[PDB]
Design an enzyme around this catalytic site. Structure first.
Site, short mmCIF file in Angstrom:
data_model
loop_
_atom_site.label_atom_id
_atom_site.label_comp_id
_atom_site.label_asym_id
_atom_site.label_seq_id
_atom_site.Cartn_x
_atom_site.Cartn_y
_atom_site.Cartn_z
N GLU A 35 0.83 -1.20 0.00
CA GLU A 35 0.00 0.00 0.00
C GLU A 35 0.87 1.27 0.00
OE1 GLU A 35 -2.86 0.59 -0.63
OE2 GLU A 35 -4.14 -1.11 -0.18
N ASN A 46 -6.20 10.74 -6.60
CA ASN A 46 -6.88 10.11 -7.72
C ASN A 46 -7.68 11.21 -8.40
OD1 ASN A 46 -6.92 6.89 -6.58
ND2 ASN A 46 -6.95 8.52 -5.02
N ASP A 49 -11.88 10.45 -8.94
CA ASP A 49 -12.96 10.81 -8.03
C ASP A 49 -12.52 11.96 -7.12
OD1 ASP A 49 -11.14 9.48 -6.45
OD2 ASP A 49 -12.63 8.22 -5.43
N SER A 51 -10.46 12.03 -4.89
CA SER A 51 -10.23 11.59 -3.52
C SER A 51 -8.73 11.33 -3.36
CB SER A 51 -11.02 10.32 -3.23
OG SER A 51 -10.63 9.27 -4.09
N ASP A 53 -5.74 8.89 -1.05
CA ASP A 53 -5.44 7.78 -0.14
C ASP A 53 -4.36 8.32 0.79
OD1 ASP A 53 -7.02 5.89 -1.67
OD2 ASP A 53 -5.36 5.84 -3.10
N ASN A 60 -8.78 5.70 1.92
CA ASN A 60 -9.33 6.74 1.05
C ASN A 60 -10.20 7.80 1.73
OD1 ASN A 60 -11.68 7.42 -1.35
ND2 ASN A 60 -9.52 7.55 -1.93
#
Length: 130
Positions: A35, A46, A49, A51, A53, A60
């Site tokens: 990760e 990202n 969207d 959003s 992480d 997220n």
């Protein structure tokens, strides 16, 4: 901060993650690795969207934490995303415990599904004394 393997194995286990909801320490260690590389400051935007992480587990901002800049935010963790960027991972771990209590469990993290699920992950905890 970037945790070394066994360092993270011991703190994750100290935070009672070993066997949480049936997920082994080794499997938690395999998620962290794929990760963020054990990096707490890791963040991934990202543009899709809109959003982001955050932290060691790449939680997220659209469903778990609030960073005040992503549409359709639920904030299921009732925590600021910025808390998932600290040297102390207690906040991120508690939020992760919340993510996995959901129906899908750990299978929520596709990185773990691709690089961890159903495979041997005992090297992640090898020689750590945990």
């Amino acid at each position: 901060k970037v945790f070394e393997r066994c360092e993270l194995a011991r703190t994750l286990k100290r935070l009672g993650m070993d066997g949480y909801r049936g997920i082994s320490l080794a499997n938690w260690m395999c998620l962290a690795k794929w990760e963020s590389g054990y990096n707490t400051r890791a963040t991934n935007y990202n543009a899709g969207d809109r959003s982001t992480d955050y932290g060691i587990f790449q939680i997220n901002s659209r469903y778990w934490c609030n960073d005040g800049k992503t549409p359709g935010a639920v904030n299921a963790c009732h925590l600021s995303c910025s808390a998932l960027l600290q040297d102390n991972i207690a906040d991120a771990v508690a939020c992760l415990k919340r993510v996995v209590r959901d129906p899908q469990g750990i299978r929520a993290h596709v990185a773990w599904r691709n690089r961890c699920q159903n495979r041997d992950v005992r090297q992640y905890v090898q020689g750590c004394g945990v």
